[PDB]
């Protein structure tokens, strides 16, 4: 019916796809290096609402750079040095029964993306820049300072059909309309600086284009809601003698 | 929400504490206390608000509401709907010292 | 044909194969000091086939072993100093300097006519696994190098010919074989579908997904 989730903001919704069968958990579940778990960080930081138009190709948001300007979480990234967090991502779209379309909501860990021109470098403002849904494009990209952005190769050169390895959920408008992906913390170092490294990239890819018939709303609003869970940081105080 | 039975969308009913200024953007509003009211799965959103006092400018709370998705309808449905609003005195109130109304004049 | 079962698809015996990775020559006497010894940063992104296999995983943890096959052509027995500089060691910039005499660089001394030289480098790194892919920057101003970290770095192998006061005018050729051991892998990743254009970048040019056929209904 409606299992109203409350944290400090409320989100009414009504499966959970765990990243690899591992829930987010503190590093303490395992002086010299004390840690400081911040337990006030979690709450639903709802991002902007993209419009799924008929002629659209796809969208991606780099994490944790999407939440770099979002409240307390944003502040802690500036203050503290080392930090680790897991995320509960709720991607919900709202559409009628006269709208037809398919989406692949996929969380890709560590996606390095090649430049548009082979053997050229691009700025950090070409991948992420606060909360923005960067848009994949049809055909090639010939703008030198941009990412490759060819939808069929997913901007990584891997083939778009094979992205089903990663924890993914399909939002087929015919039946369901919600995707919950609980991504745990995956890195090769216990905790890392949250500016240098973009941990994972969320991609929403329309596999079937929207057809809306006639005299109906021409866009389907896709909203992304991210709640950072079990976020730990580093202590800022001295140890005892 | 009193409207068509085929409309869907989301709203951000946001509450500002007594001292706080009303938010000027949806982004500002979202940082505070907010309820994402889904018009599709619910059609009534009940908000019990505390710290309601006489205050005889003034410190007063604010309830604002913002578009989040817009209204989406299928073919053959009106392009307008409305929202009605209700008010009550909740569980208990306390009133002290009689006074005449400043409405109907003698 | 019959069914049965498998155990040739385990990660350890998939990625664990001896494969040539570098071949170079050097002459003991010439006018170029560059060509009087061999340098070789260890990496597994030079042999295209080997690269593609390893890149189906994101994190890898292994301890390699390196075997050298050295031949020489023009009289007496000839010896080779096969030094290993580990990360953050001193590197020789010329043949004969104090960097060759460093005692913290494991150095084999192998003379010809004997079974090939070999040593097994352990798991060096201060991380908890090498990372094939890195989606970050070298600094937090984010203006540095892209897709490069120093925690996946491996040392260099420097080979020189141990010679007397005046060398011979011999020339030698080395071949290096490389084989992971006790491999563990974490996080799988889709196979490559483009031809590599750089040995360190992930740069590519778009290519069609699959080959075409006459008609959807037509199958022969």
DSSP string, A215-233: SS-S-EEEEEEEEEEEEE-
Q: Are A142 and A118 in contact (CB under 8 A)?
A: no
- CATH number for the domain including A179? 2.60.120.20
Q: Is the C-alpha dihedral spanning C20, C153, C188, C179 positive or negative?
A: positive
Token pair belonging to A145: 């300072």
Q: Do A10 and B30 touch (CB under 8 A)?
A: no
What is the number of alpha carbons within 13 Å of residue A143 lying toward its C-beta? 10
**Cβ of A96 and B36 within 8 Å?**
no
Say which of A12, A71, A219 has its CB closest to residue B31. Answer: A71
Dist. CA C42–CA C117, nearest whole Å: 17
Give the method used.
cryo-EM
Q: Give the CA distances from residue A46 to residues A175, A194, C217, in Å, rounded to whole numbers and listed in that order.
A: 24, 20, 46
* Half-sphere exposure at residue C180, Cβ-oriented, CA atoms within 13 angstroms: 20
Q: What range defines the domain where residue A80 resides?
A: 3-234
Q: Residue B34, CB half-sphere, CA atoms under 13 Å: how many?
A: 24
Question: How far does A70 lie from chain B, in Å, by closest CA?
Answer: 8
**For chain C, how many structural domains are there in total?**
1
**Residue A128 CB contacts under 8 Å (≥ 6 apart), including other chains:** A61, A62, A65, A66, A134, A198
Residues 6 or more apart in contact with residue C31 via CB below 8 angstroms: none
> Phi and psi of C204, rounded to 5°?
-160, 170
Number of folded domains in chain A?
Answer: 1
| Residue A219 vs residues A173, A185, C81: alpha-carbon distances, Å | 13, 34, 70
| Spatial contact of B82 and B40, defined as CB atoms under 8 Å apart | no
Name the residue range of residue C150's domain: 1-220
Chains B and A touch (3+ CB pairs under 8 A): yes
What residues of B are in contact with residue A10 (Cβ under 8 Å)? Answer: 34-36
- Determine the Cα–Cα distance for residues A73 and A232; give it in Å rounded to an integer: 11
Find out whether the peptide bond into A64 is cis, omega within 30 degrees of 0.
Answer: yes
Cβ pair C209:A156 closer than 8 A: no
- The token pair at C152 is 């996946």
Query: Chain A: residue nearest B38 by CA?
Result: A12
* Partner chains of B (3+ C-beta pairs under 8 Å): A
3-state secondary structure A79-130: HCCEEEEEEEEEEEECCCCCCEEEEEEEEEECCCCCECCCCCCCCHHHCCCC
Q: Is residue A112 part of a domain?
A: yes
- Would you call A159 and C209 a contact, using CB atoms and an 8 Å cutoff? yes
Resolution in A: 3.5
Residue of C nearest to A123 (CA): C143
Q: Are A153 and C197 in contact (CB < 8 Å)?
A: no
Whether A241 is in a domain gets the answer no
Residues 109-128 of A with CB under 8 A from C: 109-115, 118-119, 121-124
Torsion of CA C52, C195, A122, C151, to 10 degrees: 20
Q: CB-based contact (8 Å) between A160 and chain C?
A: yes
Nearest CB neighbour to A197, from listed C135, C187, C202: C135
């Amino acid at each position: 019916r409606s299992i109203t989730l409350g944290n400090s903001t409320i989100t009414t919704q009504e499966n959970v796809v765990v990243g690899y069968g591992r829930w987010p958990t503190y590093l303490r579940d395992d002086e010299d290096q004390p840690t400081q778990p911040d337990v006030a960080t979690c709450r639903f930081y709802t991002l902007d609402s993209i419009k799924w138009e008929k002629g659209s190709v796809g969208w991606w948001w780099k994490f944790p750079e999407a939440l770099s300007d979002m409240g307390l979480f944003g502040q802690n990234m500036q203050y503290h040095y080392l930090g680790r967090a897991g995320y509960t991502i709720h991607v919900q779209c709202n559409a009628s029964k006269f709208h037809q379309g398919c989406l692949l909501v996929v969380c890709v860990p560590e996606a390095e993306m090649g430049g548009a021109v082979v053997g050229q470098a691009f700025s950090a403002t070409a991948m992420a820049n606060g909360d923005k849904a960067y848009e994949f494009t049809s055909a090639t990209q010939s703008d030198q300072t941009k990412v490759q952005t060819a939808i069929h190769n997913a901007g990584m050169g891997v083939g778009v059909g094979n992205l089903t390895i990663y924890p993914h959920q399909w939002i087929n408008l015919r039946t369901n309309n919600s995707a919950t992906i609980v991504m745990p913390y995956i890195n090769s170092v216990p905790m890392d600086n949250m500016f240098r490294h973009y941990n994972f990239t969320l991609m929403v890819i329309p596999f079937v284009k929207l057809d809306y018939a006639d005299t109906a709303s021409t866009y389907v609003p896709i909203t992304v809601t991210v709640a950072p869970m079990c976020a730990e940081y580093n202590g800022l105080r001295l140890a005892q003698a | 929400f009193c409207g068509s039975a085929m409309a869907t969308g989301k709203f951000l009913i946001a509450y500002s504490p007594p001292g706080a200024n009303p938010p000027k953007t949806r982004k500002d509003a979202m940082l505070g206390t907010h309820i994402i009211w889904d018009i599709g799965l619910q059609s009534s959103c009940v908000l019990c608000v505390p710290w309601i006092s006489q205050t005889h400018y003034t410190s007063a709370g604010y309830v604002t509401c913002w578009y989040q998705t817009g209204m989406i309808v299928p073919p053959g449905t009106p392009n307008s709907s409305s929202i009605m609003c209700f008010a009550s005195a909740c569980n208990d109130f306390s009133v002290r010292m009689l006074r005449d109304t400043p409405f109907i004049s003698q | 044909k019959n069914y049965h079962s498998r155990s040739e698809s385990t990660v350890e015996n998939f990625l664990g194969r001896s494969a040539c990775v570098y071949m170079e020559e050097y002459k003991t006497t010439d006018n170029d000091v560059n060509k009087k010894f061999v340098a070789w940063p260890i990496n597994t992104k030079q042999m295209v086939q080997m690269r593609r296999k390893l890149e189906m995983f994101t994190y890898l943890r292994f301890d390699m072993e390196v075997t050298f096959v050295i031949t020489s052509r023009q009289m007496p027995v000839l010896t080779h100093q096969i030094m290993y500089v580990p990360p953050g060691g001193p590197i020789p910039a010329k043949v004969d300097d104090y960097a060759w005499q460093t005692s913290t660089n494991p150095s084999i001394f192998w003379t010809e006519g004997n079974a090939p030289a070999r040593m097994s480098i352990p798991f060096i790194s201060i991380g908890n696994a090498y990372s094939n892919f890195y989606d970050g920057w070298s600094n937090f101003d984010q203006r540095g190098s892209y897709g490069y970290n120093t925690l996946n770095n491996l040392g260099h192998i420097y080979v020189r010919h141990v010679s007397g006061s005046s060398p011979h005018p011999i020339t030698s050729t080395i071949r290096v074989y490389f084989k992971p051991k006790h491999t563990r892998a974490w996080v799988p990743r889709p196979p490559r579908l483009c031809q590599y254009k750089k040995a360190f970048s992930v740069d590519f040019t778009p290519t069609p997904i699959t080959d075409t056929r006459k008609d959807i209904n037509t199958v022969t």
